[PDB]
Symmetry: D2
């Protein structure tokens, strides 16, 4: 589709969390032994828009930030890397920015100590969601964790409605954070509802299991038979080293491959995947190639500071992928 | 439709609030001057199932009640009037039953002092919603106020999904209680979502305005043009003394009329309307006649202790309706 | 003491809860079977000031009431029985009045279903406690339940300080309501602190056990040896049918007796006891006689609508007391 | 006093907060521009016991820590510097450790972005306060911020009672953190109550103003005339560069002096003051000398990593103090 129904200024606008990541400087050790932390912007939709801007996409953001040095850093950083920050709203009720402290015990053992209670990003409200902003974009990227609590949950539902009625493609990134939710069945309720309304849904197989209210691994053919009764036209299901699979409502299926990588830290793999996959799609590369872009970007981010197009393309050309799994 | 896809034991199962109403014995005065109150079961879906049982329908209920004398009264009363109470769940966290104290200053000035914070009915959770129960019913009656807070909101969303996949007709009663919600836009978000999933939607024009996120009276033709893009096959829009209008997806429209009445107290008019309207529909009377049943029952309940079929039919035969408005 | 250090307009000012009692009309049955309830003002300090006014004392009140028909009833009723309501403050944050529904299964089995969460009376704050009001009184009556939550707890602590520095006698009524507190040790912390600051302490033996952080019945001689290291000059310890004992810092002890009574409902016994005991003390009758006044009033209130001086005195003259226990 | 009524194993046990401080590595800039933070144990009573151990005192601690890497770091660090951690209790309800991010705009402009809501240290409860532990100490150090919320507030009140009845000296460090409290009058209520029960009270003049419920600077002679009606035998009032003053119930007064210092960061000045002042007192140096120890330690901590006895003594000998203010 080489021209759209309306003129678009943004490639994507994401909605939900922009927070602080505090990354362990001394790593491959228990966090108790980590004495210094480096400050970064984090949060799945924030990471996706920052990664997208690094690839040259024009990105915007709908989210709530704290009225303090952490919120001002997040705004200044995003603006400095070329993300539009016009629709970042400053919380006026004393709410703090969420914090993720990262522990890297080894390449295979990484985890986050999260400060998530009553954080500013969860107080984004429907009245702060602007139709005039959303309609200037090709895509609306919705992250699942933004559905974990009201009023953010209703702000997201409002955003999706406004996107759909302005011919803005709704991309749902499943982004599962179990400790942000009360129960997995609660997660299933909102994930199913939102996926059914969305145009593109991207998640791991485990995340689709949650969506479907399952406690055991589901079958991709059943997943898509279900969701293709509803709005989605494209469903991307990721299986880590077993690769990734994209399915279209027209009945085609495409396969992507994990890249061989010297892993340092696995955080951010999924946000790098989404940004590069969407970049490829928006850039006319087609689904099969888009899967390589997402996979290559994921590999670079965990071994590196988000990937450049040049780094992604060099890794794709080198073509050292995993096919044995 | 004179036999269904599966055998049904219940005419309707309602989900949401069963609480205590404390009705002013000395009335036509400020509640400050009311010295005695009579105890009744209240709550919109409770009233609808109690009214339905009085008409001879077989009714069930999904709701949470307090572990105390008020909860036990509600269970015993509903059971005693022939409602199935097998899926009433007793709250084990110390939550109290909601309370409505009624003030009747005059026939034209009635209001409720409500105790609604952290009440037991709002803690109904998805894990307490049983598919095996729902599938034994012709209809699932969902009241709007049950969407006002989690976990009840997710329990209702789960119930609707289970109803739909078991060929149980979803009836959404808009039941608007503004003080149960944070903002009208929040109400619009959930009302729109739920109405779009429902088979039958019943509400006042003001309630549809809320659903549509409007602050001014909407146009019924626009309302139905919207909802008939989605699941509903029947939409009933009530306008008080100006009557009521039912619209079908096939493109038919039917009109009902308010009955002339010596009003005592307006509480319960809407629940009497829904129970008698649904009774008529279930009983094969057709939509135009069903509107008369709902209107006649509404009139009797505010002038009377829920109506009998005989009282409703006598009032319909007498045919003293309002057409001047 | 027949004239005081400053002129006094009030005999007592009480601080804490004024709420609604809903008394079962059909009684000697489970509340499930009680269909009608009569509305009264309740709450221990409210009852004490209403009872005091009925005896002819001049009483005032420091408390917070709801901005609704229940709060306005409480103000109008107290004012109508001669209590000063100038320092009742209206809650502006939507908090409801506490509610006590009374169950009378039999004379020997009475209990309350309480609505106590986030009630208006608990939001009385230090800024709403007026030194100019307190200093116009002979006595400040503090009820223990007002210490159960902030900000009421700090309002009470402020009131006590202001009383003491204006030569206003602090009377601490132990008024134990376990479900208003998180743990008994928490109750002990605040009860001990407040009793140590008070001039007169009145409670049941069980209430003093709570004060002392004991789970077994304590010894009155040990209780008073403890508290007489601190502020109290008079300690009254009640033992139901075994009578009541008052102890002075000077080392005297006095005994009172329960009155034989045809019990209907035991609620309010303690508030009737405190009001009549204080009336007798204020009226120069001395401690031994004051114990008879408290006991007689307790008997009348549970068999009856608060006692008159004439009813109390007639019962004392009749002298049908319990001495066998 | 060269031998005590009972044998003592600890010089001091402190009660309240042990948390994480995240200190700006790149400083003399807005925190937005600070990219790296170093992890330390913080919290006023924690700092006081860590500083005390560095001076060679035997210290213990009563506090609650998170069940995570931050709580385990705090325990391991305190233990590693010789503080007894036997009465650190691990929170089992998912509460996080408080966090202080430090901003150093310049030597004269330092501030903290605090994460303080529902933090683990505030859930220390009376049942977790052990009399057998407290009685093994010479002193109990109570920090004011531990009174800011229940259940910590009641745990502290319990600790003070147990200290007093075991001849353990109660030292109240006023430690004022306004954003931990609802209102200054609330702070005054608890600070006044606790100071009245304490043996030694240490605070800035501004902190005593808060204690006294004043919004303007108070007069030390009035402050001590008040508190010397109650338990204190020693009151230390600090005035920054104008020095510090200690007053005894016997009627003596002593003056201390601020040390000239190249200030880097003012955090921790007060905790260094308290630890070194108490060290001097415990070590028989007398009050006038103890004031020099507190002042010298304060100077070193803000210009430096807590002071050694040797560093403190060298600074005292050098005797470069401020007397012009």
């Amino acid at each position: 589709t080489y021209e759209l129904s309306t003129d678009r200024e943004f490639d994507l606008i994401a909605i939900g969390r922009a927070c602080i990541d505090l990354n362990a400087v001394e790593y491959n050790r228990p966090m108790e032994e980590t004495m210094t932390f480096s400050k970064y912007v984090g949060g799945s939709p924030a990471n996706i828009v920052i990664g997208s801007s690094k690839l040259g996409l024009k990105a915007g953001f709908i989210g709530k930030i704290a009225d303090d040095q952490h919120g001002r850093f997040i705004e200044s950083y995003m603006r400095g890397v070329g993300v539009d920050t016009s629709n970042l709203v400053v919380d006026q009720e004393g709410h703090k920015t969420g914090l993720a402290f990262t522990e890297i015990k080894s390449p295979e053992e990484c985890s986050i100590l999260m400060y998530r209670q009553d954080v500013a990003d969860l107080y984004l409200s429907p009245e702060e969601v602007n139709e005039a902003y959303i309609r200037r974009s090709k895509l609306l990227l919705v992250s699942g964790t933004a559905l974990s609590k009201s009023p953010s949950r209703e702000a997201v539902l409002k955003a999706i409605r406004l996107a759909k009625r302005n011919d803005v493609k709704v991309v749902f990134e499943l982004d599962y954070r179990p400790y942000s939710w009360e129960t997995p069945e609660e997660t299933a309720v909102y994930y199913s509802l939102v996926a059914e309304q969305s145009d593109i849904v991207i998640g791991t197989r485990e995340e689709f299991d949650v969506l479907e209210n399952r406690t055991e691994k589901g079958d991709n053919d059943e997943t898509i038979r279900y969701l293709f009764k509803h709005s989605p036209e494209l469903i991307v299901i990721k299986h880590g080293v077993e690769g990734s699979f994209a399915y279209t409502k027209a009945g085609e299926a495409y396969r992507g491959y994990a890249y061989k990588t010297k892993v340092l830290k696995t955080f951010g793999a999924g946000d790098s995947y989404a940004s590069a996959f969407l970049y490829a799609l928006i850039s006319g590369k087609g689904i099969e190639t888009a899967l390589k872009y997402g996979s290559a970007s994921a590999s670079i981010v965990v071994s590196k500071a988000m990937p450049s197009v040049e780094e992604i393309e060099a890794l794709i050309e080198k073509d050292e992928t995993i096919t044995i799994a």
